[PDB]
Amino acid sequence: SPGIWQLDCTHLEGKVILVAVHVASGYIEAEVIPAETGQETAYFLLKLAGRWPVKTVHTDNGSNFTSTTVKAACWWAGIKQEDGIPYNPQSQGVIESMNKELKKIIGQVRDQAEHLKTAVQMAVFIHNHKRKGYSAGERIVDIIATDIQ
Amino acid sequence: SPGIWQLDCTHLEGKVILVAVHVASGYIEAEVIPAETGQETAYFLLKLAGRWPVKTVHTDNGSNFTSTTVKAACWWAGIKQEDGIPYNPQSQGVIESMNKELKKIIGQVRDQAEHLKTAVQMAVFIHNHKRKGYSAGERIVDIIATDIQ
Numbered sequence: 001s002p003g004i005w006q007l008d009c010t011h012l013e014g015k016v017i018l019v020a021v022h023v024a025s026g027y028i029e030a031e032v033i034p035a036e037t038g039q040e041t042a043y044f045l046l047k048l049a050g051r052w053p054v055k056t057v058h059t060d061n062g063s064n065f066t067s068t069t070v071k072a073a074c075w076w077a078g079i080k081q082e083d084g085i086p087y088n089p090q091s092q093g094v095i096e097s098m099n100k101e102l103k104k105i106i107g108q109v110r111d112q113a114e115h116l117k118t119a120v121q122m123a124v125f126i127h128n129h130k131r132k133g134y135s136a137g138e139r140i141v142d143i144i145a146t147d148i149q
Numbered sequence: 150s151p152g153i154w155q156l157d158c159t160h161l162e163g164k165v166i167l168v169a170v171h172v173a174s175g176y177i178e179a180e181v182i183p184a185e186t187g188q189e190t191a192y193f194l195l196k197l198a199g200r201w202p203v204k205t206v207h208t209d210n211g212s213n214f215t216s217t218t219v220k221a222a223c224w225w226a227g228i229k230q231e232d233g234i235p236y237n238p239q240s241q242g243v244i245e246s247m248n249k250e251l252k253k254i255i256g257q258v259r260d261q262a263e264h265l266k267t268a269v270q271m272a273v274f275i276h277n278h279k280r281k282g283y284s285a286g287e288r289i290v291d292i293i294a295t296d297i298q
């Protein structure tokens with residue numbers, strides 16, 4: 001579980017928000033892109049895997065699952081690429097709820113920035129620091145450190 | 150402290166590579182930008198602080214230290230903005246040594262990507278996973294986890 005991430009793609013202001021969630025912790029990383037392509041998805045995964053020990057990625061759709069550019073980035077980064085099918089049905093609604101919460105946070109900071117990408121980074125910050133009593137940021141470091149020891 | 154980071158700016162192919170180093174571990178995050186403005190530096194720090202518990206940042210030069218955009222982003226993110234003056238004289242050469250090593254790694258992957266930004270992310274990955282026997286990625290998680298606990 002400590003190396004498992006889920007990709008998620010949501011839309012806002014005619015742009016795409018690409019999200020990776022660390023499944024065990026709820027910790028997230030996100031970027032704004034004009035549209036979801038294999039190339040953008042590949043680049044995002046290279047960034048992610050250089051920062052956290054990404055073992056497995058459940059891709060967000062079949063186009064990223066299929067993409068030769070994505071499969072190449074996963075190979076390069078030592079990531080096992082998986083489908084994102086909610087064999088546990090809980091997952092569709094869990095992603096739904098995350099997007100809705102993320103979009104709520106974005107609405108709360110939207111007026112503090114000109115550009116969507118900036119508001120998204122502020123929302124990532126707020127999400128990751130929110131105490132739930134640990135934050136997502138605390139959980140991920142705890143989970144991975146235990147795994148190393 | 151587990152919360153201390155140093156900013157560093159280096160040049161390659163007529164572009165700027167902005168680097169944040171976690172002082173205690175040597176773990177790095179980096180991005181390519183056209184040039185080092187207050188705005189770009191501010192956005193890079195918002196990204197960083199959403200991902201790791203950034204308490205203190207030693208800025209890379211006086212323009213970023215002075216920048217009201219940078220000071221506003223530090224205020225927003227709860228970051229203490231400090232100078233990066235080598236009170237330990239060994240800091241100058243340590244940064245120089247990191248840029249040299251980073252550029253060497255970039256040279257080793259340069260032909261595997263069209264765009265500089267991609268090669269820089271591959272280099273971050275290689276740097277952060279390199280053992281010498283823990284990696285920088287292991288050290289940062291271990292340092293912060295101990296700090297939480």
Ligand SMILES: O=C(O)c1c(CN2C(=O)Cc3ccccc32)ccc2c1OCO2
Pocket residue numbers: 006021022023024025026027028094095097098099101102127
């Ligand atoms: O509000 C949310 O549900 C939310 C989550 C939930 N999250 C976890 O805690 C574990 C997990 C696995 C797969 C998908 C989502 C989750 C995570 C991140 C969020 C959430 O709201 C905004 O950012």
Ligand SMILES: O=C(O)c1c(CN2C(=O)Cc3ccccc32)ccc2c1OCO2
Pocket residue numbers: 039040042043046069072073074076261262263264265267268271
């Ligand atoms: O060429 C680029 O800069 C680039 C790539 C290149 N690339 C692949 O197509 C497959 C792969 C695996 C590992 C590393 C790099 C690559 C991919 C994504 C990109 C690239 O520029 C921006 O987004």
Ligand SMILES: O=C(O)c1c(CN2C(=O)Cc3ccccc32)ccc2c1OCO2
Pocket residue numbers: 155170171172173174175176177243244246247248250251276
């Ligand atoms: O080769 C390097 O010096 C290097 C470093 C060095 N680094 C640490 O290990 C701890 C530290 C504190 C302050 C500044 C630098 C360092 C870090 C990252 C690197 C390095 O080469 C490429 O990426």
Ligand SMILES: O=C(O)c1c(CN2C(=O)Cc3ccccc32)ccc2c1OCO2
Pocket residue numbers: 112113114115116118119122188189191192195218221222223225
């Ligand atoms: O307006 C933007 O999108 C933007 C900003 C905005 N901004 C400040 O000027 C000071 C600050 C503190 C906290 C959050 C946002 C801001 C800063 C940097 C940017 C921005 O767009 C891309 O790079």
Ligand SMILES: [Cl-]
Pocket residue numbers: 038039067068069070
């Ligand atoms: Cl493709």
Ligand SMILES: [Cl-]
Pocket residue numbers: 187188216217218219
């Ligand atoms: Cl400025």
